[PDB]
Amino acid sequence: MPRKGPAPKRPLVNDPVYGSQLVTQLVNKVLLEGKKSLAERIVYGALEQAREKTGTDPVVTLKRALDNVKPALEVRSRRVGGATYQVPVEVRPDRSTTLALRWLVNFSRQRREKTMVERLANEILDASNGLGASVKRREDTHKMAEANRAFAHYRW
Amino acid sequence: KKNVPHGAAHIKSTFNNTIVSITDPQGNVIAWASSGHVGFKGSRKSTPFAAQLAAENAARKAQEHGVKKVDVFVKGPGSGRETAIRSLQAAGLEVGTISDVTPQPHNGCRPPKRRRV
Amino acid sequence: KTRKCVFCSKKGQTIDYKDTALLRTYISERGKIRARRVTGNCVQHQRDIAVAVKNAREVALLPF
RNA sequence: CAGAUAUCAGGAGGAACACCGGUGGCGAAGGCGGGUCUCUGGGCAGUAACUGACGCUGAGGAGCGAAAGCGUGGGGAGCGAACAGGAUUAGAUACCCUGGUAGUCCACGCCGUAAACGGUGGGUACUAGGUGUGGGUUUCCUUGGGAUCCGUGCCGUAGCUAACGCAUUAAGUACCCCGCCUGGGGAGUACGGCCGCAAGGCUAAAACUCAAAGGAAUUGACGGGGGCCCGCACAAGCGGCGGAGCA
């Protein structure tokens, strides 16, 4: 319900196995639309696989990855005077978290491992360390939002 | 060559372009950089991006002649006044002072008539 | 402002072109001239001050 | 690219005076604004000092009178008709750019037409107000306030107008005079005449043409008009289709 104010959102519970909101949001984003229990198993096995390959708590590793992927400035698609002038806008924490997790899932399904369990585990690792597609996209979006500061004072 | 400690950012800021002529305190344009000088012609000559590009190129030449402290002498209105200003600021030439050096014929000569497109 | 004047109401004061300081109190930074009603003074004083400012700009004692 | 743009300095040129610069003034109207000087124009205000009806209108007539244009001699920096290339375009001659001649400025002249309109002739005696606002003087608090006379706005009485609107600054109420019109074009046109270097204008019908032309107001469609807004409309996420087979 836009044009009327902030839109109410569905609340999110923590993971039963793990107990973290980021884990459950990652589950729902890796969730191929139609199945959850199998998607939950896949994200699970991915998180344990990240666990032994990191030796730490998968929730903390996912938090580190999300921080290494969370954006700070977003670019909309406003048309100003018939010319595409990019207006960067500060991102709210929920929107930035959603963007980071969406990027993580999108580049997780891109990987070429045997299973998307392995693909998601490798994506988690490559976002935590800072050598994955999600991290480089986080760098590129900030680079492009800083390259167009001349249009940043529009304040929309 | 020579060194210019203090420069002047004589910005002929036409709407066509901002010719950023850096001038020694004597009154000699030691170098200049406009939109075309960076490579901007036509509409791109008049784009705001050309303004910081021209200002930054001029300030690079300024550093090349050891120019650090510059007062800004902006001419008539154009595309990228404050844009060229903080380009020069971010390109080794601090702002110093800003001066609108625009001609003021106080009800003097007659120009051409007008345009309707 | 909003008085009868600073001359027509204070009922004692004078304007001189040689008194460049007193005239400068009404001129702008460059010497631009306030409107007929900006300073809240009786109109004749405004007009005479304007003519005096013209003359002062001609004689090079005010920032023109 | 030769040093263009630019920057500084200098010189030359020609034109105009931004800011003050506005219901604010002035002027019969066209018009008036950089500063100085000289001459001069008219108005308003308080004393009747005075003249002692010397009032008004005003056909003919008189000059003045925007801009343009032409006569005569200069100016020309710029602009700039006309005229030049390029550009959209089917066509550019036009919008746009790339220049510039007369003119545009001055001097002396011509002409007299502009939407030269309060679209409200000149003048004069009466008809609620209110409120901005220029010049004056007075009268009343301690500059403050009032009155008055003149300039200049808006709204609003009476009353008037078809309504729109006017409304003490009339289109209300009265007089006196000057100018104009008798349905619409054909027509401010023919011709004569008048003035014109030239130009044009002033004066100006008719044949013929139609049963209208028109004004105020009402409802509608019509904006690259706006406002208030709202619509997984866009901003955003997702699933996608369009690629392939198959139906």
Residue A95 lies in a domain: yes
In a domain, A4, yes or no: no
For C52, the enclosing helix (H) or strand (E) is helix C43-59
What's the half-sphere exposure (Cβ side, CA atoms, 13 Å) at A57? Answer: 9
Residue tagged 């729902």 (tokens): A28
Could you say which nucleotides of strand D lie within 7 A of any protein CB atom?
5-9, 13-22, 24, 34-36, 77-80, 95-97, 133-136, 143-145, 230-239
DSSP string, A10-56: ---PPPSSS--HHHHHHHHHH--TT-SHHHHHHHHHHHHHHHHHH-S
> Cβ–Cβ contacts within 10 Å for residue C17, how many?
17
Residue A34 lies in a domain: yes
| CA neighbor of B45 nearest in space, from B8, B70, B15 | B15
Would you give the DSSP letter of residue A89? Answer: E
Q: Which domain holds residue A108?
A: 21-148
The reply to whether A13 falls in a domain is no
Q: Report if residue A29 sits inside a domain.
A: yes
**B83 close to A (CB below 8 A):** yes
In this structure, what token pair is assigned to residue B114? Answer: 């007008």
* Percent helix, percent strand, percent coil in chain C, to nearest 5: 35, 0, 65
Q: Is residue A156 part of a domain?
A: no
DSSP string, B18-46: EEEEEE-TTS-EEEEE-HHHHT--TTGGG
Q: What token pair was written down for C42?
A: 């009786």
Question: Residue B51: closest CA among chain A residues belongs to which residue?
Answer: A150
| A47/A61 Cα distance (integer angstroms) | 9
Report the structure determination method. Answer: cryo-EM
Tokens of C16: 């001189």
Q: Helix (H, G, I), strand (E, B), or coil: what is residue A80? A: strand
The domain spanning residue A113 has which CATH number? Answer: 1.10.455.10
Q: What is the resolution of this structure in A?
A: 4.7
The answer to the question of residue A2 being in a domain is no
CA dist A122 → A15, A132, B87, B112 (Å) = 20, 9, 43, 70
Strand order in the sheet with B18-23: B29-33, B18-23, B6-13, B69-74, B98-100
Q: Are B66 and B46 in contact (CB under 8 A)?
A: no
Contact B72, B99 (CB under 8 A): yes
Judging by beta carbons within 10 Å of its beta carbon (0-12, 13-18, 19+), is residue A45 exposed, middle or buried? middle
Q: Judge whether A1 lies within some domain.
A: no
Domain count, chain A: 1
